Amino acid sequence: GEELFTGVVPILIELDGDVNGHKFFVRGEGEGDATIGKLSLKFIATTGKLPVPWPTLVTTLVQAFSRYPDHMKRHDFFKSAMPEGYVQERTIYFKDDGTYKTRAEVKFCGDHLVNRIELKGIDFKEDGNILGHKLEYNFNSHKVYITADKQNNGIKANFTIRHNVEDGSVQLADHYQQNTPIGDGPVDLPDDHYLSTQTILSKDLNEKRDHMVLLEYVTAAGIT
Amino acid sequence: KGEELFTGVVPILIELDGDVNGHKFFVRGEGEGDATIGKLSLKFIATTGKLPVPWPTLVTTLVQAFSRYPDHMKRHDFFKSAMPEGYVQERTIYFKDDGTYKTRAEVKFCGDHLVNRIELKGIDFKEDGNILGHKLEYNFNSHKVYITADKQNNGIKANFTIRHNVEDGSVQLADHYQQNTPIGDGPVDLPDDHYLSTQTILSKDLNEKRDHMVLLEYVTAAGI
Numbered sequence: 001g002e003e004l005f006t007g008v009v010p011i012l013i014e015l016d017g018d019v020n021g022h023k024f025f026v027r028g029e030g031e032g033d034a035t036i037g038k039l040s041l042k043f044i045a046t047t048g049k050l051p052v053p054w055p056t057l058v059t060t061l062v063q064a065f066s067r068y069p070d071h072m073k074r075h076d077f078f079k080s081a082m083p084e085g086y087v088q089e090r091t092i093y094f095k096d097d098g099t100y101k102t103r104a105e106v107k108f109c110g111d112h113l114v115n116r117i118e119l120k121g122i123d124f125k126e127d128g129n130i131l132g133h134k135l136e137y138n139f140n141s142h143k144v145y146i147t148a149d150k151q152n153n154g155i156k157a158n159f160t161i162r163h164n165v166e167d168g169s170v171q172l173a174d175h176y177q178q179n180t181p182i183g184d185g186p187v188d189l190p191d192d193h194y195l196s197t198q199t200i201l202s203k204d205l206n207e208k209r210d211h212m213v214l215l216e217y218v219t220a221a222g223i224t
Numbered sequence: 225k226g227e228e229l230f231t232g233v234v235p236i237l238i239e240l241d242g243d244v245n246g247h248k249f250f251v252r253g254e255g256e257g258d259a260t261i262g263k264l265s266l267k268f269i270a271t272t273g274k275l276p277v278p279w280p281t282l283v284t285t286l287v288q289a290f291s292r293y294p295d296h297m298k299r300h301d302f303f304k305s306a307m308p309e310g311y312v313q314e315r316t317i318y319f320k321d322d323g324t325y326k327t328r329a330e331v332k333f334c335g336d337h338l339v340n341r342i343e344l345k346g347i348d349f350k351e352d353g354n355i356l357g358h359k360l361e362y363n364f365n366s367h368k369v370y371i372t373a374d375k376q377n378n379g380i381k382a383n384f385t386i387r388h389n390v391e392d393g394s395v396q397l398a399d400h401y402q403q404n405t406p407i408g409d410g411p412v413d414l415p416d417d418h419y420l421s422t423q424t425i426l427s428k429d430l431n432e433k434r435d436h437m438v439l440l441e442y443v444t445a446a447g448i
């Protein structure tokens with residue numbers, strides 16, 4: 001399973017979104033290198049201008065590419081579920097605003113890792129930080145706390161994303177995560193640990209479509 | 225589940241590994257199929273730079289499972305009956321007074337996605353012919369695909385001639401010889417004689433810098 005990740009893996013991502021009735025579709029393509037915990041991806045909104053800020057979509061848009069140091073290999077649920085993959089479900093509570101509910105299927109199809117997701121958002125304020133497009137185009141570093149979920153043969157994750165707002169304030173998004181293996185087969189169930197993340201967002205200056213270029217480094221830690 | 229996999233909209237992921245007269249290329253397609261209305265909506269990207277052949281010559285190669293079979297013809301839908309394990313689709317395409325394509329594809333589900341992964345080999349094409357010379361119009365005519373059962377090989381065969389408009393007003397013919405065999409083993413539907421009637425419309429994405437083809441297609445089965 002971790003065998004599928006010894007080198008560079010091409011990635012396809014597709015997000016079917018609905019936020020307060022506003023419908024959008026995003027496609028991403030690029031590559032992940034789990035030996036160094038690196039993701040390089042470009043996303044396009046194929047439906048025109050997004051109704052939500054790009055940074056609110058970052059956590060939704062493949063943690064199998066986290067670098068798990070050698071002494072932590074037995075704790076890497078994400079890779080062990082491959083190639084059949086895992087379902088990743090989240091509820092994201094934007095503080096003083098609406099919620100995202102996401103379901104994604106992450107698997108291999110031949111040589112590509114594929115992440116297909118539907119996202120539904122409700123209860124957002126039309127003049128809030130999200131529909132009012134008031135979030136800075138950057139992304140902070142976080143700790144994704146992972147715990148085993150033996151009942152469901154998977155894992156759970158909890159973490160709070162901090163979104164910088166244009167006026168200097170911070171928009172919190174509380175993430176509640178569950179992953180379940182898709183196929184029957186042994187999976188690694190981890191002890192408590194976290195993923196430490198870093199993300200940098202840029203633009204293609206010759207790209208006229210609404211888009212986000214992303215580079216991300218992730219390392220598992222919290223086990224000495 | 226056979227036809228049951230096609231009651232809604234189904235995401236598609238196609239891949240074509242091609243070699244024509246030694247000129248190598250790779251095409252990746254994504255989009256959606258809706259077999260209830262016989263609709264295909266796809267976008268193709270040549271990842272290897274400009275194609276050495278015209279896009280319209282690749283159209284038939286790049287999922288007849290999304291053909292609309294009317295209720296009273298459902299018993300003759302081989303393509304859906306082989307799902308999710310899928311079928312191998314092999315073709316020989318004879319371009320009159322020119323070279324030949326030989327193709328082999330596996331069409332199957334990968335989770336939620338219908339996947340069409342193809343190898344194409346082209347030989348004996350003329351340097352200043354309509355194909356290598358890029359003399360074909362960017363469009364696609366409507367055809368009838370005649371399907372017949374193939375008892376021994378537990379599959380089907382199909383025969384038809386594609387008509388490619390040439391820039392000078394002439395017409396380039398391409399005789400298709402097709403065989404489909406199920407991958408699983410794996411009870412399937414062997415149809416009476418009938419046909420697929422097709423319409424295809426080809427377009428461009430004005431913001432896409434890579435060589436590409438946007439495709440919309442309607443196909444309905446008839447003859448019974």
Ligand SMILES: [Cu+2]
Nearest residue numbers: 014235236237
């Ligand atoms: Cu897809």
